[PDB]
Amino acid sequence: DYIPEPMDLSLVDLPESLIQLSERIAENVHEVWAKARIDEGWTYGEKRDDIHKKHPCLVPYDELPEEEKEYDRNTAMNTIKMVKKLGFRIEKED
Amino acid sequence: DYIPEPMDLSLVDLPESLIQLSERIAENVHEVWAKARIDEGWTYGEKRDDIHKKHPCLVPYDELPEEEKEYDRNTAMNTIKMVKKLGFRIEKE
Numbered sequence: 022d023y024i025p026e027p028m029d030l031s032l033v034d035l036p037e038s039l040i041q042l043s044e045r046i047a048e049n050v051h052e053v054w055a056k057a058r059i060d061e062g063w064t065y066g067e068k069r070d071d072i073h074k075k076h077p078c079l080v081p082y083d084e085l086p087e088e089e090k091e092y093d094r095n096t097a098m099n100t101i102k103m104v105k106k107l108g109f110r111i112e113k114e115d
Numbered sequence: 116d117y118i119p120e121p122m123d124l125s126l127v128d129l130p131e132s133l134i135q136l137s138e139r140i141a142e143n144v145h146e147v148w149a150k151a152r153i154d155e156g157w158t159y160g161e162k163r164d165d166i167h168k169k170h171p172c173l174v175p176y177d178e179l180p181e182e183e184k185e186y187d188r189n190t191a192m193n194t195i196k197m198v199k200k201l202g203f204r205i206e207k208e
């Protein structure tokens with residue numbers, strides 16, 4: 022009975038100067054995720070494993086497989102697009 | 116050898132009107148995640164299971180346990196704070 026129905030942000034316009042920073046943003050978010058997991062005793066492991074608290078994405082961001090990095094940049098951008106869709110201006114300062 | 120060191124955003128100031136919308140944002144972000152998973156064959160299961168592609172968070176956002184929603188909202192706000200920290204202004208139109 023559950024069907025995800027995310028909002029259509031395909032036409033939201035973000036500043037190019039911000040999209041260029043996608044990678045910074047995804048990186049910080051990954052760092053926060055990994056500090057949280059690591060604080061709860063998680064460590065790096067080749068195979069994901071709930072019992073030994075093993076996760077393969079517990080590596081520096083640069084070392085993530087490219088599709089995981091795509092995922093993270095895209096997530097970052099969805100979130101920000103959602104903020105622009107809810108009626109906020111986003112502009113680079115001077 | 117790997118130590119995560121996220122940036123300190125504790126002192127970044129967001130409009131209150133935006134923080135009030137945390138739940139809308141986190142929800143939509145949950146929908147995007149759940150649609151991607153479900154498209155790759157994942158379904159709801161009370162225990163997480165990579166073989167049968169089972170995940171207990173594949174439920175409507177409202178049904179998520181409160182600590183999971185907490186996590187989702189905080190993540191949403193981290194991301195937006197990081198934009199403000201990188202030199203962008205964010206203001207209600």
Ligand SMILES: [Mg+2]
Nearest residue numbers: 069070071165
């Ligand atoms: Mg598992």
